[PDB]
């Protein structure tokens, strides 16, 4: 599976039938339709004690992994019950600035989309959590092109080291707090992973307020390769999945 003409999103349902399931992601967030729910609590992001280990090019994107053996980087509050631990953060981007985000707002597509993945500690490991309906929590942050994101630069400079599929690099002392917007106002709804196996185990929390990145930051993302080293070069662009039918589900807003 991939993002090309022959193995793209429109073909995933042949290997992964859940692809056409009842609670697929991403979705188009309709702001006039999203319901303001007063019973939603503020988000609780505790990331001061986070411990990054590495960055890798898994052939469909780049992931920064964290030590999730203890409650070091955690998410709680919001629509969530219990503590969810930070395991990884990844991005989805386009060939152009006009596309890249997975989630959309009023049909508006952003330059890229950052996902912070967390798993419910009640289930013991990441692999058990993806077998559950309340198994994961993904924080979605929209990136727009304007000014540079200081906090983003350490990631930017290491992409050269992981250009191709299978590459990884030591990535310690990275502080995720540098990627967060000023506001934690959000939208929430029940969905799934945006890549195979599209397990319908996620509680989405999409931040209203996007982060701005400079043109040159996003440019380095586009220099990544889908392919493995020693193979024809396929730029890693448009690694995003198109909006899926809402189908009954309701999107709640914390504002
Ligand atoms: Zn993602």
Curated annotation (Swiss-Prot):
Which top EC class is given?
Answer: lyase
Mutation: residue 138 to G; reported impact is: Weakly impaired activity
Q: Which GO terms describe its biological process?
A: angiotensin-activated signaling pathway; carbon dioxide transport; morphogenesis of an epithelium; neuron cellular homeostasis; positive regulation of cellular pH reduction; positive regulation of dipeptide transmembrane transport; positive regulation of synaptic transmission, GABAergic; regulation of chloride transport
List the active site.
60
- Variant or mutagenesis effect after changing residue 115 to D/N/Q: Reduced activity
Q: What is the effect of changing residue 58 to H?
A: Reduced proton transfer
SUPFAM superfamilies, sorted: Carbonic anhydrase
Write the record's keywords in alphabetical order, separated by commas: Acetylation, Cell membrane, Cytoplasm, Disease variant, Lyase, Membrane, Metal-binding, Osteopetrosis, Phosphoprotein, Zinc
Keyword Manganese tagged:
no
What changing residue 194 to A/C/H/P does, per the record, is: Strongly reduced activity
Where does the record place the modification Phosphoserine?
A: 161, 168
User: What is known to happen upon mutating residue 88 to P?
Assistant: In OPTB3; in Czechoslovakia
Q: Which reaction does it catalyse?
A: hydrogencarbonate + H(+) = CO2 + H2O; urea = cyanamide + H2O
Q: Which GO terms describe its cellular component?
A: apical part of cell; cytoplasm; cytosol; extracellular exosome; myelin sheath; plasma membrane
Q: Which PANTHER family match?
A: CARBONIC ANHYDRASE, CARBONIC ANHYDRASE 2
Q: What else is known?
A: Target of drugs used in treatments against glaucoma disorder and breast cancer.
Family per record: Belongs to the alpha-carbonic anhydrase family.
Q: What is this protein called?
A: Carbonic anhydrase 2
Native organism: Homo sapiens (Human)
State the gene name recorded for this protein: CA2
């Amino acid at each position: 599976w991939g993002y090309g003409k022959h193995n793209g999103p429109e073909h995933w349902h042949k290997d992964f039938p859940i692809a056409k399931g009842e609670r697929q992601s991403p979705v188009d967030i309709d702001t006039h339709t999203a319901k303001y729910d007063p019973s939603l609590k503020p988000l609780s992001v505790s990331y001061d004690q986070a411990t990054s280990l590495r960055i890798l090019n898994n052939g469909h994107a780049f992931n920064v992994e964290f030590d999730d053996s203890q409650d070091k980087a955690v998410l709680k509050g919001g629509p969530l019950d219990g503590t969810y631990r930070l395991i990884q953060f990844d991005f989805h981007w386009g060939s152009l600035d006009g596309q890249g985000s997975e989630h959309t707002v009023d049909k508006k597509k952003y330059a890229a989309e950052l996902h912070l993945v967390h798993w419910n500690t009640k289930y013991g490991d990441f692999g058990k959590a993806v077998q559950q309906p309340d198994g994961l929590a993904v924080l979605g942050i929209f990136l727009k092109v304007g000014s540079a994101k200081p906090g983003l630069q350490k990631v930017v400079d290491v992409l050269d080291s992981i250009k191709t599929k299978g590459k990884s690099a030591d990535f310690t002392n990275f502080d995720p707090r540098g990627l967060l917007p000023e506001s934690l106002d959000y939208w929430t709804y029940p969905g799934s992973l945006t890549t195979p196996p599209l397990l319908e185990c996620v509680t989405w929390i999409v931040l209203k307020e996007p982060i701005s990145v400079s043109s040159e930051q996003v440019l380095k993302f586009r220099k990544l390769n889908f392919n493995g080293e020693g193979e024809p070069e396929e730029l890693m662009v448009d690694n995003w999945r198109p909006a899926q039918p809402l189908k009954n589900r309701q999107i709640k807003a914390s504002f």
